[PDB]
């Protein structure tokens, strides 16, 4: 149905995302159990890690476009990523390595993330009808890898330990690289312009030096999340001032702020919603016991089922508004489940969490899947950078928000933890409802500006 290079990009993306989500699904638990962080520390540290992973994406796009070439930057990113995963596995021998290893994952993603999608864009002549389907399938590839990793990585870490889990993340990256190398010939006429000139070693060294520096800067910021907050606040004011100086930008700015709220809520799945599942949900569904950390796999699960369907079925501000209403309902459902539908021992049916994750995933499909693609319609590289920066700020804020659900390690009674989760989730859902209403009220004006 699709050009041959589509299938290579599909499976490279799948395996890279498998590696990443293998880490994300277990990271907060790893912080608490293996490193002895409190739940607050683990949550803010995860926020900083995720912020760095997403905030640097603009650099790897620049490197792929103008310095080394898309295909070269896929290879370099994949190698740095595999090194990071193996460094994380080694961090169990040498714990002092952990932050450096995570910085290496962050920088790796920053080099890698933009480039397979960029490559995929080039596999179709520019007005090929198959493009839309190709990107829906690309997103499904991302979410199949995420589904497998979030299902299995907690089981693997429980049964064999974290070093094996992280080494398997690295192996997933290695097999992404092997699939690329084996299929290299399929993309021989595909790439950005530097891909087809001989590689500039001057530029290659500038990229390796900048990467190493960035690895150390990321490790430092994740260890010191207070200065990370400071840095991002300063960066945001500066970028907003530059943006305002340079009426479709006003619409791009407002849609970006709404996306910020969405990413704050997305950041709860690996942190507060994960520990909500651990502490206050039954670990049995359809008669099968499961690792409660695996409940995170409900996000890609619902995306995989809903993206074809939802591809089959207003315009921008209203789609964004709908997504915000879905997210509101996800957190109100979590709160309601805890307030009214819990056991006398304090436990809720896991079907409430299946529904929470459905709501959250529909929100994802409406906001972030369909976001900077159509922020690019109001504007270009600068706004791309701003989107990633604001999403990094959102993950830092999300980690901070998650700390309101942190439970001390000596609490053992689910009836003590249930009211904390319900209070926080109910207030998140109400604030998000308010945001959705203000979005709705602005839809006519916003939609006017696009005219």
């Amino acid at each position: 149905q699709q050009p041959r290079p589509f299938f290579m990009i599909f499976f490279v993306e799948l395996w890279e995302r498998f590696g990443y989500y293998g880490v994300q699904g277990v990271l907060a638990v790893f912080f608490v159990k293996q490193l002895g962080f409190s739940q607050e520390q683990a949550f803010v540290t995860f926020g900083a890690f995720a912020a760095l992973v997403y905030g640097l994406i603009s650099i790897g796009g620049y490197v792929g476009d103008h310095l080394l070439g898309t295909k070269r930057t896929i290879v370099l990113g994949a190698l740095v990523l595999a090194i990071g995963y193996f460094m994380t596995g080694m961090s169990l021998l040498k714990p002092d390595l952990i932050f450096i290893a995570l910085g290496t994952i962050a920088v790796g993603n920053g080099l890698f993330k933009a480039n397979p999608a960029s490559l995929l864009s080039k596999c179709y002549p520019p007005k090929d009808p198959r493009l839309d389907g190709a990107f829906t399938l690309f997103y499904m590839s991302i979410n199949i890898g995420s589904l497998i990793a979030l299902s299995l990585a907690p089981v693997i870490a429980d049964r064999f330990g974290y070093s094996v889990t992280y080494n398997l993340c690295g192996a997933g990256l290695i097999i992404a690289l092997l699939v690329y190398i084996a299929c290299r010939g399929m993309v021989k006429d595909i790439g950005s312009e530097p891909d087809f000139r001989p590689m500039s070693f001057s530029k290659l060294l500038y990229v390796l030096l900048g990467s190493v520096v960035m690895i150390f800067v990321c490790a430092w910021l994740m260890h010191n999340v207070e200065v990370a907050n400071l840095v991002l606040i300063v960066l945001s004011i500066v970028v907003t001032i530059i943006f305002f100086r340079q009426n479709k930008m006003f619409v791009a700015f407002v849609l970006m702020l709404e996306a910020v709220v969405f990413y704050i809520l997305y950041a709860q799945m690996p942190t507060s919603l994960n520990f909500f599942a651990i502490n206050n949900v039954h670990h049995e569904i359809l008669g099968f016991s499961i690792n409660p950390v695996s409940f995170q796999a409900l996000n890609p699960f619902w995306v995989v089922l809903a993206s074809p369907i939802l591809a089959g079925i207003l315009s921008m501000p209203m789609k964004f508004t709908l997504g915000m209403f879905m997210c509101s309902l996800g957190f109100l459902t979590a709160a309601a489940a805890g307030m009214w539908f819990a056991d006398a021992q304090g436990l809720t049916s896991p079907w409430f969490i299946v529904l929470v994750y459905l709501f959250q995933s529909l929100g994802e499909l409406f906001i972030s899947a369909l976001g900077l693609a159509m922020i690019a319609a109001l504007v270009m590289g600068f706004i791309l950078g701003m989107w990633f920066l604001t999403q990094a700020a959102a993950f830092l804020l999300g980690g901070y928000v998650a700390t309101f659900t942190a439970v001390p390690d000596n609490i053992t009674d689910p009836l003590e933890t249930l009211p904390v989760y319900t209070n926080v989730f109910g207030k998140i859902g109400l604030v998000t409802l308010g945001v959705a209403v203000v979005m709705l009220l602005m839809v006519p004006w916003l939609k006017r500006m696009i005219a």
Partner: nanobody
Amino acid sequence: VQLVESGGGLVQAGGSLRLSCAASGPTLSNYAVGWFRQAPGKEREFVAGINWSSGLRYKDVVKGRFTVSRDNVKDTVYLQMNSLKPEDTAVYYCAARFGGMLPLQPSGYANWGQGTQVTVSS
């Protein structure tokens, strides 16, 4: 996923016994381990437990007599039963739930040992 209990037996009032729980596959370190007991003609009831991060929970009628503790090297959990009384006579079970919570009812736990008889004679 499967827990082996050991260490039951027969003891006179005021004596002591130690139960131990070990898991074949999953590292027990990630699990809250609760000890339940079923006396003749009654339901399983929570006795005592330790979560994955050394938090402890006890039934009122056993405080000051039973201690739950954990050897994370041997991947083992212990219930030390001192000042035993006839009414501590029961089948004892260890049960394991992932995480930090020790819920009171058997349905909060997915993994169960087979049970060891503890008898305390007057």
